[PDB]
Every structure is written in structure tokens, then in C-alpha cells.
Enzyme design. Sequence first.
Site, PDB file in Angstrom:
ATOM      1  CG  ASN B 186      -1.796  -1.142   1.273  1.00 54.39           C
ATOM      2  OD1 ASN B 186      -1.790  -1.839   2.543  1.00 54.39           O
ATOM      3  ND2 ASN B 186      -2.332  -1.716   0.260  1.00 54.39           N
ATOM      4  CG  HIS B 188       0.852   3.306   4.034  1.00 53.95           C
ATOM      5  ND1 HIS B 188       0.762   4.554   4.536  1.00 53.95           N
ATOM      6  CD2 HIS B 188       0.051   2.665   3.442  1.00 53.95           C
ATOM      7  CE1 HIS B 188      -0.589   4.825   4.181  1.00 53.95           C
ATOM      8  NE2 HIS B 188      -1.095   3.899   3.352  1.00 53.95           N
ATOM      9  CB  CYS B 223       8.060   7.496   8.988  1.00 58.66           C
ATOM     10  SG  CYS B 223       9.461   8.170   7.498  1.00 58.66           S
TER      11      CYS B 223
END
Lengths: 265, 264
Positions: B186, B188, B223
Site C-alpha cells: 500500500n 506505507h 513516516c
Amino acid sequence: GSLTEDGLSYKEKFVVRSYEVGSNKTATVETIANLLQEVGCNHAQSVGFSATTTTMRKLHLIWVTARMHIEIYKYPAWGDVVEIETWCQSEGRIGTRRDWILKDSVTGEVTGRATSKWVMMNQDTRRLQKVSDDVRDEYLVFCPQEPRLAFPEENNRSLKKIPKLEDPAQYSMIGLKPRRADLDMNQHVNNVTYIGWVLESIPQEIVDTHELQVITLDYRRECQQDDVVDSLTTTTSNDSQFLHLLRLSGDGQEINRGTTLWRKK
Amino acid sequence: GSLTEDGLSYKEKFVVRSYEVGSNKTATVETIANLLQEVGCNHAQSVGFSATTTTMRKLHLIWVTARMHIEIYKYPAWGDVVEIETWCQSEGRIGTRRDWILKDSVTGEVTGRATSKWVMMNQDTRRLQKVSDDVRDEYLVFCPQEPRLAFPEENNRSLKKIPKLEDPAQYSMIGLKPRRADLDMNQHVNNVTYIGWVLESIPQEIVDTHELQVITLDYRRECQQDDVVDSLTTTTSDSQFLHLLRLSGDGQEINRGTTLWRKK
Ligand SMILES: Cn1cc(N)c(C(=O)NC2CCC2)n1
Ligand SMILES: Cn1cc(N)c(C(=O)NC2CCC2)n1
């Protein structure tokens, strides 16, 4: 995994893991690179190695990758089984060659292939040398006698001279450092990190609309744990081709150079 | 891998790979973290998931890690088979808990264990939400009814409040960025990267003479792909360290934790 019936190659099946895939839910080229590395290690272990021979450890000699070439037709999906067959071959006194064939475990079709050129180097002085006759015969028993080339073609993409990228680069990724996960059991930066670092300069737009078909990477110098890399790229070309260059942030010492080919999804 | 006879947990064996080990020729804590993540994905897939329930996907709801705690007694060696058993349990409307037990496939002894606290967030607004009923019931069929805790002990290391590191830090690793390999499907940053980033501030001298026994990590903020992290560490003591990950710019805290190391 296991050696084939003739003991002149090794095969291994891998189930693709969830953290090993990208946005398209298929394995990344670095996952493939890791799998090829792993099957090469198991092949070396299965024939009585650890891949330094008896005469290599005596003289403090190691095998180092000089070139990696990978061509992928289809990336295995998360949950799929991929079978990889690997073998080695002598290239006279130049070094060794290691080839791979990637297959879908269900259909049995070739979904990718790779080739690598390894040169002999003194572990301490870092000085390359030609394969000696005593060492050549020690590994020749584990290799096919007749040529077995994953890339046979009379003019394949694995043997092309790679030029050096000229400044200014079209795209760049600056300040790249290896972490402890990037190091191998001997504390050297893993050869697969350079592949990832090369690809960091490719724009996210190309990655989102294209699939990586071919990658050729020349290893010129090793990046230390405390070194900082700069990844540089320029488009040279339904197909996009790029010229790449990895160099030390400070002095600008070249550590890697290569080319990638991408096709529209 | 496969579910156990009762269907209330999942087991999986992994052969430790050559690139998955450190200088001691045993698996790194990030390899272990990857294996636990992988067995948790297979467990979720084996019970009909895509761990988003029916109600969760309609409401645009996801499970996010709030806390990870790992204790290792023995690191598997390159070539060894490690068996991991994982299961989920509910903790009322505060969230979900996932536990793991690591075992040597040959001897059958417990060589490690882990626990994680997951909270329910809205994918888009990133807003924490309590676990309402209906979605509580939709997944309580895949969980044991009686408590099954990998860390039972009353007053154990996994439930301790972690303090915030004070400036100046004793050790630091600055300018840390994630690459495409650090991102999940995804896009991330993978939860295991934060573990690696935390450990980047530990001096190489401690890593060469000690083994990591326990690690507790609190996830405060994600982050982004284009963000830069600073890893900070201070010895508080066996050696014990207090850790802090923060954004290079504003200094926004993204993670905090503690590690415990034993002399080899
Ligand atoms: C030390 N070692 C053992 C191997 N089998 C490899 C190897 O094949 N490396 C290449 C780089 C892309 C994979 N490297
Ligand atoms: C997306 N996902 C699924 C899981 N099962 C995990 C997980 O257990 N991650 C933790 C942090 C490193 C271990 N993360």
C-alpha cells in the site's frame, strides 16, 4: 531444494511472502535478486562448499560479482510458488558465470532468467586475479561440460558495453546510506542493495505505469558501511530505457553503472 | 502453514535464509519481525480476510500497530527451521492484541515470543476510533474465548510506560530515509523499518559483544515515503537503552522504545 539427477545444477521452490511484494501485489526485483542469491548459496552448500574451494581459502581468495543481468517476463504474485534452477560454469581464466531460470510452479513456464559474471579477488589486498589451474579443476566437477547458457542468443542484452552517465543527470536520489539490514554475514553491503539504490533515481511515475523488464548492473567498487551513495539516471530511449550511475557522495568515485528497460503496463 | 485443530490459532515453519542472518550467522531481529508479520498475514488469509472485517471495509477502517514487544532467548541459525504460532484476541473497545510463540522445529523449545497492540483507525482522516460492537462480533469467532497470553506474568515488560528521551542523546543516527524496499503493498513504510531505524543509533561495539534480548516499540506517527528520520539513543542501565525516532525537520516524534541486551 535439491540438486538435479545429474548433480550439475540445483532447484528450489519459494512461496512469495507478503512483505516481498510491491504495489501491484507481485514480487519486487529485489525479492527476485534475494531468491537468486539464496538458491546460489544452497547450491554451493549442497556440493561441499563455504563458495571458496580448498585452494581459495589457503590463498585468501574470494569470488566477487562483476556483473548481474536479470530479465523478467512475469513477476510472481504474493502467495505463488516460484521454482528457480541455478548452475555454474567456468569462463576460462576470466572467472565464473552463474545462470538462473525462474518458473511458475503451476504452469512450468519460464517467467524470468538471470546471468552473473564473477571474478576472483584477494580478500585482503582487493586485487583481482585470473583463475589458476589448480582452482579451475576444483570447481569444474560441479559444472556442466557442454555450454549451458540461460541467455544463448547471438547478440543478447547481457553482454553489452555500458557507457558512463554524463553530468547533469535527468533524475537523482542523493544521500543514500546502508543500514545493518543492508549488510551480509561478513558486514559487507549486500549486492541486492545496489540494485535497490540504482532504482531509487527512477521517478515514481515510471514505476507506477511501467513494469521493469531488464536490468544490467556492473559492480565496480564496494560501498562501505560508513559510505554515502548518489543514484543518477537519464532516459536514453511503449518501452523506456535508462542509463544509471551509483557513485560516492564525496569524491564522486564510481561504484556501479547500468541500464534498465521498462514496458508500459 | 495451517490453522490448529480448533481453528483458533495458526502455525508456520520457516527455513532461515542466508541474507536473513547477521555476523553471528543467526537471524536478525528484523528477520524475526518479518516472519511474525508474514505468519499474521497467512493467519488472516486462512480465515477469510483481505485483517479488515465486513463493517470495517464499508467504514474505511483499518488496524494499525500501536505497540510491538519482542523477547528472544535464542536466534535461529542460517539453515534452521523456526515454527511460529500466532493468534488474535480482543481487548474490549480499546483494540486488538496479537501474540506469537517462536520454537525450534527440532527440539520444540520456545526460543522467543512477541505481543502487539493494534488500534482501529480511519484510513483517510487517520483518526483513532474505539472498537464498536457488530465489528467486535464479526471477528470474535476467530479468537479464543479464555485469555491466551504469550506474556502472562503480572507486571511484565510488555505493559511498561516508555518515557521520552531527553536532549542531548548519547548516540544518534541522522538522515534516515526509506527506499522502495521499505514500503509495503500500500506504499506505507513497513512497521519493521522502524525497528531497524531504532537499532541504527546503537553503537556497533554493543552489537558486536551483546545479543538483543528484548525490544519494546511504541508507534506514534507514520513516516511518509518522502520523510527523513533521526534515531536517538541513551544508555539507562545487561545493557538497557531508551530510544526515540523523530522527523529531521520539525522534530515530530514518530516512535519511542527500549531495548535490553545481554553480554555474549
Ligand atoms: C554472495 N552471493 C551469493 C550469491 N548467490 C550472490 C548473488 O547471486 N548475488 C546477486 C546480486 C543479485 C543476486 N551473492
Ligand atoms: C501489516 N501487518 C500484518 C501483520 N501481521 C503485521 C505485524 O505483525 N507487524 C509487526 C511489527 C513487525 C511485526 N503487520
